[PDB]
Write a protein that binds this ligand. Structure first.
Ligand SMILES: *[C@@H]1O[C@H](CO)[C@@H](O)[C@H](O)[C@H]1NC(C)=O
Lengths: 97, 7, 275
């Protein structure tokens, strides 16, 4: 059970307007996992994480999030490491999705 | 907060 | 209308350093109200919802005793499961189970559930009659015979009629403003031209509670389920949820397509087009 990843903002994004960036990681098993959020390819150290829970199919899910103000030039992403994968898995924030 | 022993 | 108290429990036989041997999270409907865990035999509890500030000290003291007992019991059961399946030690194995009770509009009991899984696969399920069990293999068949000849389901009924309903009633009263509400979705259609010349129409729904929602697209009258691109409903992080559903349409025909949003905060589905 490899993790699925969604990266998205709490509110519709607006440049120069503060917001929250979410990394929603789901459908993985076992629960051990590493999640790192990135800005311009570099680790964001100020990341909060919800408690881990699981759904009725027994797979686990968790929400990582961080405060951010979007701009025209900064990129954001979420990188996940799980035993079910040989290599890490990264998903980039797309402001239209 | 409840648990049943299975074996 | 209907409301549910739900607990999601996980026990792990060989956790990594700093990871819990046992963790459970509790919800009323789609709102988490606490986290319990045990790390290196040390139990900890954290409230997650405002109405838990109303609980008297004795609630937390009794909860801590339950965490200790449950963690201890789950570890023992993991030991036994390892032997019945002739599985080697040195590897980490996982025991999960869900506990819940549900009431209807009259706040009277409607149903309850107890279900367990081993290493991510169904192991045993308590049936709707709350007295017989559904097994999946020869080992869980041993469990079924033991529970049914022992009548252990009667002890779960006593938990449901007692503590489960007690807390569910009390949480719904103390957290009425949060739990006995429905926030309807705020919806709009976004327009994204593609190089091919066609167009992505993405129907958004934001700010709704509870999480259950349906987004669908129609052209004229036909439903376009097979043509849609959807995302799983996802938490915005502030207590509300969001979702979108998209179709690819020819340029100049965007007004032929209608998005419908179904949510319990609405009396009829919301219909909208690109504007
Ligand atoms: C498997 O069963 C055999 C015989 O019943 C026993 O000798 C062995 O210890 C078992 N293995 C494990 C890992 O329990």
């Amino acid at each position: 059970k490899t993790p699925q990843i969604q990266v998205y903002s709490r509110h519709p994004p607006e440049n120069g307007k503060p917001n929250i960036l979410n990394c929603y990681v789901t459908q993985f098993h076992p629960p051990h996992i590493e999640i790192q959020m990135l800005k311009n390819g570099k680790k964001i150290p100020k990341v909060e994480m919800s408690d881990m829970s699981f759904s009725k199919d027994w797979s686990f899910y968790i929400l990582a999030h961080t405060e951010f103000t979007p701009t025209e030039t900064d990129t954001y992403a979420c990188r996940v490491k799980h035993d079910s994968m040989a290599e890490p898995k990264t998903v980039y924030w797309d402001r239209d999705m | 907060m409840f648990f049943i022993n299975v074996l | 209308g209907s409301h549910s108290l739900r607990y999601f429990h996980t026990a792990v036989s060989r956790p990594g350093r700093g990871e819990p041997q046992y963790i459970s999270v509790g919800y009323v409907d789609d709102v988490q109200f606490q986290r319990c865990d045990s790390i290196e035999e040390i139990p900890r509890m954290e409230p997650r919802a405002p109405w838990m500030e109303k609980e008297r000290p004795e609630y937390w003291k009794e909860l801590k005793l339950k965490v200790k007992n449950i963690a201890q019991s789950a570890r023992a059961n993991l030991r036994t499961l390892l032997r019945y399946y002739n599985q080697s030690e040195g590897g980490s194995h996982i025991l999960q189970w869900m506990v819940s009770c549900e009431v209807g509009p009259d706040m009277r009991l409607l149903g309850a559930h107890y279900q367990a899984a081993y290493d991510g696969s169904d192991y045993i399920t308590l049936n709707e009659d709350l007295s017989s069990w559904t097994a999946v293999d020869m080992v869980s068949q041993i469990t079924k015979s033991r529970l049914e000849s022992a009548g252990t389901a009667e002890y779960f009924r006593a938990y449901v009629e007692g503590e489960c309903l007690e807390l569910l009633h009390r949480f719904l009263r103390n957290g009425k403003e949060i739990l006995q509400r429905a926030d309807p979705p705020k919806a709009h259609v976004a327009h994204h031209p593609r190089p091919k010349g066609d167009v992505t129409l993405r129907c958004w729904a934001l700010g709704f509670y509870p999480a259950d929602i349906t987004l669908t697209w129609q052209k004229d009258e036909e439903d376009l389920t097979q043509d849609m691109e959807l995302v799983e409903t996802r938490p915005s992080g502030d207590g509300t949820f969001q979702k979108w559903a998209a179709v690819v349409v020819p340029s100049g025909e965007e007004q032929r397509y209608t998005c419908y949003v179904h949510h319990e905060g609405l009396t009829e589905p919301l219909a909208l087009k690109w504007r």
